[PDB]
Amino acid sequence: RFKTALEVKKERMNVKKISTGSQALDGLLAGGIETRTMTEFFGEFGSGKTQLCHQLSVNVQLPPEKGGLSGKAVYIDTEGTFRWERIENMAKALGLDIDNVMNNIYYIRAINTDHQIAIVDDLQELVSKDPSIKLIVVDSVTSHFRAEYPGRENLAVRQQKLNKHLHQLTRLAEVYDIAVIITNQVGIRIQLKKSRGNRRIARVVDAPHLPEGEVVFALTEEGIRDAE
């Protein structure tokens, strides 16, 4: 039939969140990763940030009753650490179908700063031609900017470009209703710190709607999960 754009906004405006696989982490996130928002995970190598980028990429495919949005993911690789083998282990843990899972994850390595900005330019067309995409992950988003504008001498210029790039990401998330996650090796900012063994701690460092505080979770062979 013939609708009004107001009906279309009401029918589509509902809060969409994507589970991390850990109930505890979800709690810290008021349910999970949210569309129309950019969420950053930052911390040291192995703190959990990239692993989360792999996990969320599969969970997004899960139906709503299982924590996903029956959507697809784009995984933009900055330092070439993306491993399908991890995606493989995770979709297996959930009993999902591997070839399909892997099939629903667009992937690309951004080789340098200009290619990284170009890719992000191109996503509108991609998410435009394919409405099933509900997740964009940009791992180590600052990597190439730090390597291309090194030192506190170039600090200001670096801040300038990055801010611009990250703005494009926000615009994308809000106009197309997509969840964007960026990670950094160091609206919502989450620090990740190594705890004992495979345990890791997550704490809200910036998020006006999220209660400040931290939680504990684990990096397991099956994926992101609650610590034993």
Author numbering: 72 to 257, 282 to 323
From the paper:
Members of the RecA protein family include prokaryotic RecA, archaeal RadA and Rad51, and eukaryotic Rad51 and Dmc1. These proteins play a central role in homologous recombination, an error-free DNA repair mechanism [for reviews see 1]. Members of RecA family all contain a central ATPase domain that is preceded by a short β-stranded polymerization motif (PM).
In this study, we present the crystal structure of SsoRadA 31 overwound right-handed filament at 1.93Å resolution. In the final 1.93Å resolution crystal structure, SsoRadA protomers are packed into three extended helical filaments in a 98Å pitch helix with three protomers per turn. In contrast, chain A does not contain a visible NTD and has an average B-value of 48.2 Å2. As in other filamentous structures of archaeal and eukaryotic RecA family proteins, a conserved amino acid residue (Phe73) in the PM is responsible for the assembly of the 31 overwound right-handed SsoRadA filament. Phe73 is docked into a hydrophobic pocket (which includes Val145, Tyr177, Ile190, Asp193, Leu194, and Leu197) of the neighboring protomer. Intriguingly, the overwound right-handed SsoRadA filament contains ordered polypeptide backbones and side-chains in two important structural regions, L1 motif (amino acid residues 219–226) and NTD (amino acid residues 14–69), compared to those found in the previous lower resolution P3121 form. Surface potential analysis of the entire (HhH)2 domain of SsoRadA protein revealed a 92° arched basic patch along the border of the second HhH motif. A closer look at this structure revealed that the linear basic patch of the L1 motif faces the arched basic patch of the (HhH)2 domains at a distance of ∼25 Å.
